[PDB]
Structures are given as structure tokens and as C-alpha cells.
């Protein structure tokens, strides 16, 4: 619920939401000029992620770095990997690329308060969360692994 | 059934065969398992899940249950699963899926001949497999043992 | 059940008090058999961590083989002599602060709330079950350098140890 | 009833092994009285009883724990091994997907009750036997834990009923004799040298129910070495070459376990001590080095498996 | 943190009221588990509210009438015998009493949030 | 479920040996309170890997590694210590 | 998930009370500077380190091919040249 | 699965075999060729590392190694410290009549250790490989084997570097557990923020245990006191390339695991490090001033020479990079080896390591008086030499990304330090006629073998620690090439 680490940014362009099977709001923005998402590399990322009504909670601009995430191989939240790879047929990200994900809590952290470290949790629960990813790279160097 | 046997449950419904004296042990959760005492992942299994239904081509088509059967309740992320051609028949009355994927982790390259049915509240998965380094020479015997589960009343 | 618990905090309560008898007994034979003590208590928390390859080479190799090695060092009794070794004004301060921040940090923390997440690489991949194998693949292969190294480390520990117990 | 049917499995392996140890007393005096030239049956049982109706005889010296406690570890260190012998596809203790490891740790850690028991008798005599029993509980440790490795490399797991099953796929001929006969013979120098039987005290205090504690602690050690012998190399219940099946297989695994103990006191009436200087350097220089040999060609010969 | 959850003081009815749909739509997304056969984390999960429901529902029934704490302490026992019986088939793993018992506490636990 | 109070227990083991660890007047005290910290970090390990990776057992692993890499450390110091042993009088 | 030990730990309740036990019913009822063992159990720590290396392997050997195989062999070829070096060097002696 | 990018590494271990092969056929017949063969190696994995210099940041094992052009330059400066003290106990084994076999496999093995450390990403190898450095160090300072202050010396130093390195993976262990299961680094953050627990006191706790850990296997100032107990008693040689070795793998280490999985904290994480930092620049060239022993007080130095290195830790890869850590750490290989191999040949001419017996050198020797002045000089920087400019890169990258009070310290505590240089300077320049002792008054150069090869590694270091103050555009021309650490 609350613990938003107070990060004020200036928005992402809105766009609609062309929803997967999976239940995933999906939404490209900018498409990527490059290679696809490789299943199983470290990729890096910039994304700032949002609650329902909008408050921004992390950000990688607010520790001004990319994300390095494997995708694919479970290590990110089900969204994250279907919003960036596509299991359904959804296009995957290329690099260089944007794009918009209303994360549903079937595929967020469920009903579940994930991260509760005193009293108040990071993130409440059902919070069908909001990423607006910023693929920059593939890690430089990066095994399928 | 040159070398085979039709083990059978009749407190249970499946019946199906064994390819060359396989032993007997008990998996986590499966009931028979019947893995072959020098091969690892070279295992026959087989279980239930407690459904409603009767029939497996009202719960979705083949080509549809397959896939989020495979890559959604057996292949974990950590490996990608190749999934092979899917083969329908039918036995007495009932519908037969049949199917073929291949979970490459990283490493533990391994395969799956696994089947799938339905019947009497009950939806059988039975699964078998090998390793990918040795399947070409060990594809047609488990093979003509996965297409041999049948289900009784 | 209502056992796991209460074996867990009953091998806690044996395994601090064996502790406590490898920090403050003066005959050290008896700190080297407490130690033990507090080692076989390790291993049932590994059994109760659904840990078995882990607490069975923990019981094999730290008891089996350490305990006995340093019994032997104990027997044959040596002598006696900002963190250093001093203490009664600084080591109780540290440790005490260090403790309380822990204390802080644990116990004021939702461990089940992040059991909850990180669930996707925690699904037990179906086709192998067995927690020994599960262990032998992800040695050998997936952390290979380190498992290559250890045997350099114990070559070298082995040949330096004969270099010194020798003279 | 949630705990009766999972006490009963233990209760009746106990009751088992306490006759197994009381024949295997009743075999070495057979044995003895067969090679040197009714009653005997409550003989074991008579002595049992005489060392326990006994004085305490305990000194001054103040290590009542290590005194009370050497002895059961030493007890705890054998007994709690008989969780893994698959005597046949059924009444196995536990299905224990890693079987002969928990052994190998559990002999493995019998010599820090050899030395608790040393020093808890304040004895200058107890103390140097208990360094010799410590030092040849570890120095025959390494190859029979190497043979032990090389035979789960056949079977290609740890759990021991996996193993009794994998010994019977070539048939009789498909038992570990005729695989590893080298390692069969690692594992038979060291059940007799680990056990201190072939060669050799360290108990002149431990008086009473103490001795009898290490009286059968030896004797289940024997015990569980003999059936471990059998599962591993001789087969467990597979003769190749419902219900009874079980109790045939108890009596395949026990007849084979005879046969072991039998050339086991032959072999200990054979051959005389080996004087502690042979001893570490067979255990050491020249078991090591041939038990590593039987691990490279298990390990060249699996390729092609 | 259930180690000073033991030292916290106990909860509001009302916050039972909340907790027991929470433990609810918690119970209901394990099928993703149950069907991967991750046994380890579905006994997490199960001790956990179990503990939870333990300490829940005596504290819930104080905001209920009368007429309703009959057939609510009944579904509530029901529900409490259906998840020791999938506490016992999950700690001794066998999936399709796991399953069924599971699809018992869910349709029961579908009707404990309504009290 | 109590089950992560082992970790507060992996704390007490962390820090009263390296009181013991500190407050050490013979060596071999202090070794074995250095093998009751490699102790503290490992349960840590395997109660993390039980709690968050079962699937790939990374803490599990980590102690095979820890406890060979405290076998080492033993076996060093111990030859150190009966070395000593020998070149005192 | 305490399956697989849930008996043992019944068996090591029973196993670790009956010595206590039989005290209870039989209370009721009635300088040496020998350093070469030390070496031996010095060689002793490290061997059985890498017999633990080397069950889990051996445990996972089938499902890996040849690469498992190289790995061993690196590994207890390490061991027995540490075992010459035992052997050249007055390490056993005895 | 061919790991290639490992050869440079693998190179050394191929070696080691053939250590023990001579250890095996003949047992005392080689004194000179083992040396060889393992010189040999050394320049052949350096070779083999500048023959893999132009290949990508590829991470070659199945996440457990990043063969980075940064991990590549720790990896040659760890070559190059080996290889420049290889030749340093050629005569040091001879004297103390030690076995030159297994002393070779020690040093080669640490070699080994830190090269892995410096490319290690798994946990497991930020836990293995600085044990094989730290359990290969306890070997290496109890080698004389003489007397007992020595062994007492090593036995604590097991005993605090093993309760180091167990702060360190307890970190390491809050670390894996905060972050899901996570290790490999570079998913280490990611798993922080996939549980959401990078806004967490766990995490604080693994920062704070991994730094003091890295402060002890660094050896700063609250951090420090094993370095004065243990290398007073571990052998001269022995000392240059632990203290040498270990800080340089362990500034790689503190690059890798602070700047990939400690970025989001890096605010607190800085603080923890200036603070250290500080105290690490001030107290130990504030005790060396006051301490008769020589290498005792140039462990103090080296622990003030650390503490102006962690200003280029600091400092991110962006407003002035890694490029001054990484030739300060070259320049302070070049300049404390010779300084070592000065102490060296003083102490196998005269015996003895305490400072007033340097007290005349400049009369006996003026060559090696010459060496040691111009080693020391440069470790304290008055004119252009190597460390000078170092400390001007450090104090250069520290005003532009603005830690004044980091230079500002560290300038104060460079004229500290140049205050004991000189002091030493002082002895080894004047003399009296018996403000020399009878350690100094019988010197002996010319009772010797030959022309070593010590003095040609001590000229070596005297013209490194000269000429590349002056010759530095190259030095930092390949040392900003490293901005892949990220």
C-alpha cells in the first residue's frame, strides 16, 4: 500500500491497452530497432511501474540505472516475462524499444502483499500494477543460461 | 505385449504396459512410476487430478490443451519446452491424446512421450521419458507404450 | 505439524546451549564435545530444511572428519595466547549492537511475504524429484568453476598441511 | 492410530536386529566351538543379563557426560543405520532417496564416540586404544566409501532398494561380484578391518551395562556391515540364477547374510592380527590406491552406458 | 513475520474479516502449485493460514449474529477438518486426495467469507 | 510456522562464537568457534534455499562448497596447531 | 515436506531416549606426544571432502554425458596426484 | 560448453600439474628448472590474457564468470604482481633452507585465486576464490617454520581471515535470501526488486557485513589490525605478495559486488566506504610515523595507499571512472614490490627488518640506498614519480566528481606519509660510524651467488615506479577503455 519512496517523474506516453490471452493489458509504444528479446539472456531495462490509479512506486531512473533481468527462465514476475518475450503470440521487444504493461495480479504478485518489511508492504494486494518498459540493451556480455 | 505387462488398477481405471522388466517404485505423488534401474529420467508415471468432466475434447480442442498442458503445468520456466506433434484416437468410446515435448534446461537435455485422458471424476496424465542424449534408439518403445493406456468401466 | 515447530525450537534451545558450552566451558574437550553436539543439531535442522544430501554430508564431513580432527588438536592441549581480540568492554558492545540490528532486521521482516514471490524458480521442475540429483547436476555443471576450484583448494590444503605438520 | 502403524515398522526392526545379534552370537560360539572342539540359545541372553545385573565402578574423575554418553553415541552411530537395508521390495524402513549415504555418514561419525568414550574412562590404557580405534575407524573409512561410490556409480543412485533392483537386470551374473570384484574386495577388508575384527581392547573401566553397550554396538556394527554386503554385492532378494515375497526375500537377504557371517569368523580364525603397521599401510597405500582404481574403470566403463 | 506476529497482540474482528478473504483469493491461486507439484511451498502456504485461519475465525465470530454462528462455526469446522486432512495428503504427498481435498477447502472457504 | 526462527538461531551462532571467536585464548577454541560461524552462514544458506529456490538448489550447493571450503580451513589450522605442538617445549 | 523422515524421526526420538532409559533402570537396578595419527586423520579431512564431491556426481551421472565424465576424471586426478604426493612425502608412515 | 575465455587461468592449473610431475619422478633434483616452468607459466597465461584482450565482456561458464575487459586488467596487474614477485623468493627459500616445491604451488594457487576473483560473478566464486587466496595466504605466511611468533603470527591470521571472510558470506548469504534465491550479481538486483525487498533492513545488513568483510580482506583502518601481527612474522617475500595480491583482488572484488548488486543502495554504501576510506588514509599514515619495525610500518603504509585507492572505488564509471583505482593499483604494485625487494636484499645481506639498521646503507650500497630512496619517494610522491601521479588521477577523479573532503584528507595524509618515507630516507643517506649497527657494518654484497634476479625485478620496480609517473598517457589511455564494469 503504501512505502511509494517518493520518486516524482514526468509520465510515459498513454496509450490504449490491446489486452493478451493471458489476461496481460498489453501495449507497444515505441518498437525496438534490433534483435528480439532473447528467452534466457540478461537483459537490460529502464521501466518505471505504477499502482491503479497511477502512483509510481520503482523506478530504475530513480537509481539511474538499467535493470538487468533473465528473462524467461522465471527469475522476473510473469508479466514482466510476458509483456517482454510473448508467450501467447504477443510480439516480443527488440532493442531500443517501449512499451506499456498493465500487469493483472493473476500474473503480478497475486493477492499477496508482496514485500512487507515492517508493518506496511511495498506493494498491496490485487494491485494490477502499471510497467511502462524502456528496453535499452541486451547485456553485453549474456548466456542463455 | 511381446515383453510387456498390462499393469492394472482396477481401484483406480488405467492400465498400460512396461517396455523390458522395469522396476516398481514410488514417485513423489504418482501412484506406479515404474522407473528401469539403470537409466535415470527413463520412467513411465502416471496420475489423477480430481476434475468434473467425462469427455477431453469438451474441456478444450487438442492442439489448444497441449499447449498450456506443456508449457503452462509440466515445463517450469528454467527450460523451454519443445513441443512436438500431437496425435488423437480413440479407443472404445473415449477420446486419446497423445503428444511429445522435450524440456531443454540449460543443461538436462530430456524428453517426454507423455499421454493424457479423462474419466470417472478423474484426468489421467500418464508420462513417460527418457534423456534427449540417448531418445532416437529408445523413441518407438516408449513410444507403443504410451499410446497403451487405456481406461475401463 | 505442531512437531516441526517444536522440534525446531527444541533443537534451538539444545543448539544454543551447546553453543554456549563451545563459548564458555573451561575444560575445552567438553567445548569440542558440545560443538558436536551443536552439530548434529545442525544436521536435523537440515533434515527438517528438506535438506538430506546437504545434512548428511554436513554430518559426514564436520563431525565425522572435523570434530574428530579437532578433538585430537584439543587432547593434545596447546596454549593459551574495531574488531580484534580484546573484550569485556568492546566485543560485548559490538556483539550486542550487531545482535539487536539482527534482531531488528529478522524478526521485522515478512520472510513468508517474499516466500510468496519468487515462486516462478521455486516450481520443481516435474521431471526429476530426487534432491540428490537435483544437488549432482547443479554441482557439476551449472557452478562448475567453483566445484573445479575446490579441488585445487584441498589439493593445495592438503599439500600445505603436510608442508606444516611435518616440522 | 496416526503413529501405531509408523511405530510398528520400528519396533519390529528392532526386535529383529536384537535376535540378529543374539544369532550372531550364537554363531561365533557355534563357530568357535565348531573349530576348536538348548543352552546356547540363552546363553547370549544370560551373558546380556550378567553384564547388565553388574556394579557401576565409576572413579572420582568428574566427566559424567562424556562417561554416560561416549557408549550411546557409539550405540546411536550403528543402530541408526538399519533404516536403509531393503530386505526386499517391501518393509524397508524408509524409501530414503539418499540410502547408503545416511550409512556412510552415520559409520563416519562412530569415532567421535570412540574418543568420548576414551575419555571418559580417565584410563592412560583406554586413552591410547581409543586413539588406535579412532585412528583405524578412519583409515579404512576412504576405500570403503570410494567402493561404496563406484557401486551407486553402477546403479547410477543412492536410495539402496534402487540398487538391490539394479543388481537384477543381467540376471544373477548382473550382481555386483561379477562388476566389481575388486571393489567387493574393498568392501570385504574393510567390514573386517573397520570393524576391528581381523585385526585389534580400551575398555578397562567401562564396567557394567556400559561394556554390554559396546558388546553389541560391535556386534550391530558387524551386523549392519554383513547386510550391507549383501544388498550392495551378493543381491538383496533377487535369486534370477504378493505377500510371501517378502518373506522369501528376508530369508534370501538372511541366508546370504549367514553365508557372510560365516566366512567372516573363518576368516578372522584364518589369519592373526596385523600388528597396526600392516594395518594403516593397507588401509592407506595400498586399499586407497587400487579402491580409486575400481572407481576409474567403473567410471571409464559407465561411459558407454 | 510470524515470530512477532506471536508478539504483536492479536487483530480486529474486523481486520479477521479482512484477513480471512485475503487467506481466501490466497487459497484460491495455489491451483498454478498444486498442479506443478511444488509440494515444499503449498505446506508453507497451508501451515501458514492454517495458523492464520486458527487465530482468524475466533476472532471473526465476534461480529456476527447469533443465528448466523451455528452454520458458520459448522462450515468453519468443516473447513478447518477438510484442511488438516489436505495438511496430512500434502505432507504426505499424494496429488489426487491433495486435489480433491483442495477443491473441498476452496468450496468451503467460498462460503466462510459470506459468514 | 515458526520455520524462520531458525534464522535468528543462525544469529545466535553467529555471534556468541565470535565472542568465542574473539574472546579465544587457545587456538582450537578458536577454530571451532570459526567452524560454529561457517555454521551460522550455512544453515542461513540452506534456510534460504528451502524458503525461496527448492527448483535449483543455490544455498544447498553453497554449503557443499562452505563446508568443503571449512574442511580446508580445519585441516590448515589444525596442521598449524599440532605443528606447534611439536616445536614447543 | 516430511514424508521421508517422518519415521526416521520417530526412530531417532526412540534411539536417543533408550539410552536414557536403560541408565534410568540401571539406576533404579544395581601423557603421550604421539603425533602420527593426527597426519593420518589430517589426510583423512580432505579425501573425504572430495568422497563428497564425488557421491553426487556419481549420483547424477547418467543425465550428463561425457562432460561429467572429464570432470571426474579432473577431479580424481587431482586426488591421486595429492595421494603420490602422500606417498612420496612422510605423510602415512606407518 | 567450451569456456575459452578461461585459458589464461586454466594455463596456470595446466602448470601446477606439472609442478607436482616434479614433484613426483625425482623429488630433489630440480631446484632451478621449477622456477622455470613456473615463470614459464606465469608469462604464458599473461600472454595468453593480452592474446584474449580484444574479445567481448563474454560470461563464459553457466553464470558463474564475466571475463570483462575490467576483471581482464585485475587479472594482468594480479600476473604481473605474481611475476614480479616470482623472482623475489628465489633466495629466500635457500636461506631458510624451505622447499622451493609447494612454495611455488602456494604462490601459483593464490595467483590462481585472485584470477578467478577478479572475473568471479557467482557468490559461490565471490566465496571460493578469495578462500583460495585467503587459505593459500595462511600457508604462505607460516612457511618459515623457525620458531613460534611466526606460527602464533599465521594462526590468528587463519583465525581473523576466517571470521572475515564468514562476515563476508553471511552478507553474501542476507544477500541470496533478501534477493529471492538469487545470486550471479548481475540477477542479484534484480531478485532484490522482484520480492521487493531492495526498501529493506535485510539488505542494509548484507551491505553492511559484505563491506566489513571487504574492509577486512582490505584491510582499512577500523578493519586492520591483522596486517601489523602477521606480516612482522610471515616471511619478507611472502608479505610483498600477499599484501600486494590480496588488496588488488580484493579492489577488484569491491568494484564487482558494490557497483553491479549495490547500486540502488549506493548512497549508504558510499558513506560506509568514505568512512573507511577516511579513516583508512588518516590513522594508518598516522601510526607508521611512530613505528620501529619496517615492515610493519609499510603494512601501514600500504593500508593509507588503500585508503586513496577506495577514492576511485567511489567514484562511479561516469564523472571520472575506474581508470585511476586501476593505475593507481599498477603504480602501487611497481612501487611497493621494489620496495619489498629493497627490504628483501636488506635482510639477506644483513639478516635483520628493524629500521635502525638501515642506518648507513648509502655508504655500503649505493645502488640499492639509491633503489630504496627513489621506491620510497615514490610511494610518498614528492617529485614526478609513479605514485605522485597516481594520487594526482585519484585526487583528479575525486575533485571532479566532488568528494572534497576525500582529497583533502588524502592530501594531508600524502604529506603524513611523506614524513616517515623521509625518515627512512634520513638513515639510508646518513651516517656516523656507529649510529650504524653491527647488522649494517658487515653488509657483504659481493659473498653472493651472482647477480641475482632479484635485483633485476628491484630495477624493474624502480623504473616503474619512476619513468610512468612521467609515462602515464598510456597507462590511462588503456585504462579507460574498462567502462564495461557498469
Redesign the interface.
Known amino acids: 500500500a503504501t512505502r511509494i519512496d517518493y520518486y516524482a517523474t514526468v509520465g510515459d506516453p498513454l496509450c490504449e491497452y490491446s489486452y493478451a490471452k493471458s489476461g496481460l493489458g498489453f501495449c507497444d509504444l515505441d518498437v525496438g530497432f534490433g534483435d528480439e528479446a532473447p528467452r534466457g539472456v540478461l537483459v537490460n531495462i529502464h521501466y518505471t511501474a505504477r499502482f491503479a490509479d497511477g502512483t509510481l512506486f520503482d523506478s530504475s531512473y530513480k537509481r539511474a540505472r538499467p535493470l538487468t533481468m533473465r528473462i524467461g527462465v522465471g527469475k522476473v514476475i510473469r508479466g514482466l516475462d510476458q509483456g517482454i518475450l510473448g508467450g501467447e503470440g504477443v510480439p516480443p521487444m527488440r532493442v531500443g524499444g517501449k512499451r506499456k504493461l498493465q500487469i493483472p495480479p493473476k500474473l503480478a504478485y497475486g493477492p499477496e502483499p508482496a514485500g512487507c518489511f515492517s508493518g506496511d508492504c511495498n506493494i498491496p494486494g490485487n494491485a494490477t500494477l502499471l510497467y511502462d518498459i524502456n528496453f535499452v540493451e541486451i547485456y553485453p556480455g549474456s548466456n542463455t543460461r | 505385449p511381446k515383453s510387456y505387462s498390462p499393469f492394472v488398477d482396477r481401484e483406480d481405471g488405467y492400465s498400460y504396459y512396461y517396455p523390458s522388466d522395469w522396476r516398481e517404485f514410488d514417485f513423489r505423488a504418482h501412484d506406479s512410476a515404474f522407473k528401469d534401474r539403470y537409466l535415470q529420467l527413463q520412467n513411465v508415471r502416471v496420475r489423477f487430478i480430481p476434475t468434473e468432466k467425462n469427455d477431453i475434447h469438451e474441456v478444450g480442442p487438442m492442439e489448444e490443451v497441449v499447449y498450456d498442458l506443456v508449457k503452462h503445468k509440466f515445463a517450469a520456466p528454467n527450460q523451454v519446452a519443445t513441443i512436438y506433434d500431437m496425435k488423437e484416437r480413440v479407443e472404445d468410446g473415449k477420446n486419446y491424446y497423445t503428444f511429445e515435448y522435450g524440456l531443454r534446461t540449460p543443461i538436462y537435455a530430456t524428453t517426454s512421450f507423455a499421454t493424457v485422458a479423462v474419466g470417472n471424476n478423474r484426468y489421467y496424465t500418464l508420462i513417460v521419458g527418457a534423456n534427449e542424449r540417448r531418445w532416437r534408439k529408445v523413441k518407438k518403445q516408449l513410444q507403443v507404450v504410451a499410446d497403451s493406456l487405456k481406461i475401463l468401466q | 505439524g505442531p512437531i516441526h515447530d517444536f522440534l525446531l525450537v527444541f533443537l534451538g534451545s539444545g543448539l544454543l546451549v551447546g553453543g554456549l558450552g563451545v563459548v564458555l566451558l573451561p575444560n575445552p574437550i567438553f567445548s569440542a564435545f558440545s560443538l558436536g553436539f551443536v552439530l548434529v543439531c545442525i544436521s536435523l535442522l537440515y533434515i527438517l530444511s528438506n535438506s538430506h544430501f546437504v545434512a548428511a554430508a554436513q554430518l559426514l564431513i564436520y563431525v565425522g572428519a572435523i570434530n574428530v580432527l579437532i578433538i585430537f588438536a584439543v587432547m593434545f592441549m596447546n596454549d593459551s595466547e574495531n574488531l580484534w581480540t580484546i573484550g569485556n568492554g568492546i566485543t560485548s558492545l559490538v556483539c550486542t549492537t550487531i545482535l539487536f540490528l539482527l534482531m531488528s532486521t529478522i524478526l521485522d521482516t515478512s520472510w513468508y511475504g517474499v516466500i510468496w514471490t519468487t515462486k516462478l524458480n521455486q516450481i520443481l521442475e516435474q521431471d526429476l524429484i530426487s534432491n540428490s540429483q537435483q544437488i549432482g547436476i547443479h554441482l557439476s555443471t551449472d557452478f562448475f568453476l567453483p566445484f573445479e576450484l575446490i579441488s585445487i583448494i584441498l589439493l593445495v590444503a592438503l599439500i600445505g598441511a603436510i608442508s606444516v605438520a611435518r616440522q | 492410530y496416526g503413529?501405531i502403524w509408523?511405530?510398528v515398522?520400528?519396533f519390529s526392526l528392532?526386535l529383529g536386529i536384537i535376535t540378529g545379534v543374539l544369532v550372531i552370537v550364537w554363531l561365533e560360539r557355534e563357530i568357535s566351538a565348531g573349530i576348536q572342539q538348548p543352552l546356547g540359545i540363552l546363553q547370549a541372553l544370560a551373558d546380556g543379563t550378567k553384564l547388565?545385573?553388574?556394579?557401576?565402578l565409576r572413579p572420582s574423575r568428574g566427566n559424567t557426560?562424556?562417561f554416560?554418553?561416549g557408549p550411546?553415541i557409539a550405540?546411536?552411530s550403528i543402530?541408526?543405520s538399519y533404516?536403509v537395508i531393503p530386505f526386499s521390495?517391501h518393509l524397508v524402513?524408509?524409501?530414503?532417496?539418499?540410502g547408503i549415504?545416511?550409512w556412510?555418514?552415520?559409520s563416519?561419525?562412530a569415532?567421535?564416540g570412540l574418543?568420548?568414550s576414551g575419555?571418559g574412562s580417565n584410563n592412560?590404557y583406554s586413552?591410547?586404544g581409543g586413539?588406535?580405534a579412532?585412528?583405524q575407524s578412519?583409515?579404512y573409512?576412504?576405500p570403503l566409501?570410494?567402493c561404496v561410490?563406484?557401486i551407486?556409480?553402477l546403479?547410477?543412485?543412492?536410495?539402496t532398494?534402487?540398487i538391490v533392483?539394479?543388481q537384477?537386470?543381467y540376471g544373477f551374473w548382473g550382481w555386483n561380484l561379477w562388476r566389481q570384484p575388486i571393489g567387493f574386495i574393498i568392501f570385504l577388508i574393510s567390514s573386517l578391518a573397520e570393524c576391528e575384527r581381523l585385526p585389534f581392547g580400551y575398555q578397562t573401566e567401562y564396567s557394567?551395562?556400559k561394556f554390554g553397550?559396546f558388546y553389541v554396538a560391535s556386534y550391530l556394527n558387524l551386523l549392519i556391515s554383513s547386510l550391507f554386503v549383501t544388498v550392495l554385492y551378493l543381491g538383496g532378494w533377487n535369486i534370477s540364477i504378493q505377500i510371501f515375497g517378502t518373506t522369501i526375500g528376508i530369508f534370501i537377504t538372511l541366508a546370504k547374510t549367514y553365508l557372510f557371517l560365516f566366512v567372516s569368523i573363518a576368516t578372522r580364525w584364518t589369519l592373526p592380527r596385523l600388528r597396526?603397521?600392516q594395518l594403516?599401510?593397507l588401509g592407506?597405500?595400498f586399499l586407497?590406491?587400487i579402491s580409486?582404481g575400481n572407481?576409474?574403470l567403473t567410471?571409464?566403463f559407465?561411459?558407454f552406458? | 513475520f510470524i515470530k512477532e506476529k506471536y508478539f504483536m497482540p492479536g487483530l480486529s474482528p474486523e481486520d479477521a474479516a479482512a484477513r480471512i478473504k485475503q487467506t481466501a483469493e490466497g487459497l484460491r491461486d495455489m491451483r498454478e502449485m498444486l498442479d506443478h507439484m511444488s509440494w515444499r511451498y503449498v505446506i508453507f502456504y497451508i501451515r501458514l493460514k492454517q495458523a492464520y485461519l486458527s487465530q482468524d475465525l475466533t476472532n471473526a465470530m465476534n461480529i456476527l449474529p447469533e443465528s448466523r454462528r451455528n452454520d458458520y462455526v459448522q462450515a468453519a469446522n468443516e473447513l478447518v477438518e477438510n484442511m488438516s486432512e489436505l495438511d496430512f495428503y500434502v505432507r504426505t504427498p499424494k496429488v489426487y486426495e491433495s486435489y480433491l481435498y483442495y477443491e473441498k477447502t476452496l468450496k468451503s472457504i467460498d462460503n466462510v467469507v459470506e459468514f | 510456522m515458526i520455520l524462520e526462527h531458525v534464522l535468528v538461531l543462525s544469529a545466535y551462532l553467529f555471534l556468541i562464537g565470535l565472542y568465542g571467536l574473539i574472546t579465544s585464548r587457545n587456538m582450537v577454541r578458536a577454530l571451532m568457534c570459526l567452524e560454529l560461524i561457517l555454521n551460522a552462514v550455512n544453515m542461513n544458506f540452506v534456510t534460504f534455499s528451502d524458503f525461496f529456490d527448492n527448483s535449483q538448489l543455490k544455498g544447498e550447493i553453497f554449503c557443499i562448497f562452505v563446508i568443503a571450503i571449512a574442511a580446508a580451513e580445519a585441516a590448515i589450522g589444525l596442521a598449524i596447531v599440532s605443528s606447534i605442538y611439536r616445536n614447543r617445549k | 515436506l516430511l514424508y521421508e523422515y517422518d519415521i526416521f524421526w520417530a526412530f531417532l526420538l526412540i534411539s536417543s531416549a533408550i539410552p536414557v532409559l536403560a541408565f534410568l533402570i540401571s539406576g533404579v537396578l544395581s601423557l603421550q606426544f604421539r603425533i602420527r595419527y593426527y597426519m593420518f586423520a589430517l589426510v583423512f579431512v580432505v579425501f573425504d571432502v572430495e568422497t563428497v564431491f564425488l557421491y553426487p556426481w556419481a549420483m547424477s551421472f547418467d543425465v550428463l554425458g561425457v562432460s561429467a565424465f572429464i570432470e571426474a576424471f579432473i577431479f580424481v586426478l587431482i586426488l591421486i596426484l595429492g595421494l603420490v604426493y602422500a606417498w612420496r612425502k612422510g605423510a602415512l608412515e606407518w | 560448453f567450451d569456456g575459452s575465455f578461461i585459458f589464461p587461468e586454466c594455463i596456470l592449473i595446466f602448470g601446477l600439474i606439472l609442478l607436482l610431475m616434479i614433484d613426483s619422478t625425482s623429488d630433489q633434483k630440480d631446484i632451478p628448472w621449477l622456477y622455470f616452468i613456473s615463470s614459464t607459466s606465469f608469462v604464458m597465461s599473461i600472454t595468453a590474457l593480452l592474446f584474449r584482450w580484444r574479445e567481448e565482456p563474454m560470461i563464459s561458464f553457466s553464470g558463474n564468470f564475466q571475463t570483462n575487459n575490467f576483471n581482464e586488467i585485475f587479472q594482468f596487474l594480479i600476473l604481473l604482481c605474481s611475476t614480479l614477485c616470482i623472482p623475489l623468493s628465489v633466495e629466500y627459500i635457500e636461506c631458510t633452507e624451505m622447499a622451493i616445491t609447494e612454495f611455488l604451488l602456494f604462490i601459483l594457487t593464490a595467483t590462481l585465486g585472485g584470477m578467478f576473483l577478479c572475473g568471479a560473478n557467482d557468490l559461490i566464486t565471490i566465496f571460493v576464490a578469495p578462500e583460495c587466496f585467503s587459505l593459500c595466504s595462511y600457508l604462505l605466511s607460516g612457511y618459515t617454520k623457525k620458531d613460534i611468533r611466526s606460527n602464533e603470527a599465521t594462526m590468528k591470521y587463519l583465525l581473523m581471515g576466517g571470521a572475515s571472510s564468514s562476515i563476508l558470506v553471511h552478507g553474501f548469504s542476507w544477500l541470496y535470501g533478501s534477493s529471492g534465491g538469487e545470486i550471479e550479481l548481475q540477477e542479484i538486483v534484480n531478485g532484490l526488486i522482484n520480492t521487493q525487498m531492495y526498501n529493506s533492513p535485510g539488505i542494509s545488513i548484507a551491505l553492511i557485513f559484505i563491506t566489513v568483510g571487504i574492509g577486512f580482506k582490505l584491510s582499512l583502518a577500523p578493519s586492520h589490525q591483522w596486517t601489523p601481527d602477521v606480516y612482522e612474522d610471515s616471511p619478507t617475500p611472502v608479505v610483498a605478495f600477499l599484501s600486494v595480491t590480496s588488496k588488488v583482488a580484493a579492489s577488484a572484488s569491491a568494484t564487482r559486488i558494490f557497483d553491479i548488486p549495490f547500486y540502488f543502495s549506493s548512497n549508504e554504501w558510499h558513506l560506509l566506504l568514505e568512512i573507511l576510506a577516511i579513516l583508512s588514509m588518516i590513522f594508518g599514515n598516522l601510526i607508521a610515523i611512530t613505528q620501529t619495525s619496517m615492515k610493519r610500518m609499510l603494512a601501514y603504509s600500504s593500508i593509507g595507499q588503500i585508503g586513496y585507492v577506495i577514492i576511485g572505488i567511489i567514484v562511479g564509471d561516469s564523472n571520472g571512472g575506474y581508470a585511476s583505482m586501476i593505475t593507481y593499483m599498477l603504480f602501487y604494485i611497481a612501487m611497493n614490490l621494489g620496495t619489498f625487494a629493497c627490504i628483501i636484499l636488506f635482510g639477506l645481506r644483513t639478516g635483520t627488518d628493524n629500521i635502525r639498521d638501515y642506518a648507513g646503507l648509502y655508504t655500503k650500497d649505493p645502488f640499492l640506498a639509491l633503489s630504496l630512496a627513489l621506491c620510497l619517494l615514490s610511494l610518498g610522491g614528492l617529485p614526478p614519480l609513479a605514485g605522485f601521479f597516481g594520487k594526482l588521477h585519484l585526487f583528479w577523479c575525486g575533485w571532479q566528481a566532488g568528494l572534497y573532503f576525500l582529497v583533502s584528507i588524502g592530501l594531508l595524509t600524502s604529506v603524513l606519509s611523506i614524513y616517515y618515507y623521509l625518515k627512512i630516507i634520513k638513515l639510508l643517506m646518513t651516517g656516523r660510524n656507529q649510529e650504524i649497527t653491527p647488522h649494517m657494518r658487515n653488509y657483504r654484497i659481493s659473498p653472493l651467488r651472482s647477480n641475482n634476479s632479484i635485483e633485476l625485478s628491484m630495477i624493474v620496480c624502480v623504473i616503474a615506479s619512476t619513468i610512468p609517473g612521467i609515462s602515464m598517457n598510456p597507462i590511462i589511455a588503456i585504462a579507460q577503455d574498462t567502462l564495461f564494469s557498469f
Request: no cysteine; proline share 5%.
Open positions: 503413529l509408523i511405530f515398522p520400528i528392532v547388565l545385573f553388574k556394579e557401576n557426560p562424556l554416560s554418553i550411546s550405540v546411536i543402530l541408526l533404516s521390495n524402513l524408509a524409501d530414503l532417496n539418499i549415504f545416511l556412510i555418514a552415520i563416519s561419525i569415532p567421535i574418543l568420548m575419555y592412560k586413552f591410547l586413539l588406535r579412532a585412528a578412519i583409515s573409512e576412504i566409501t570410494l561410490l563406484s551407486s556409480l546403479s547410477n543412485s543412492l536410495s532398494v534402487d533392483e539394479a537384477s537386470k557394567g551395562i553397550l597396526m603397521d594403516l599401510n592407506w597405500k586407497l590406491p580409486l572407481l576409474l567410471t571409464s559407465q561411459l552406458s
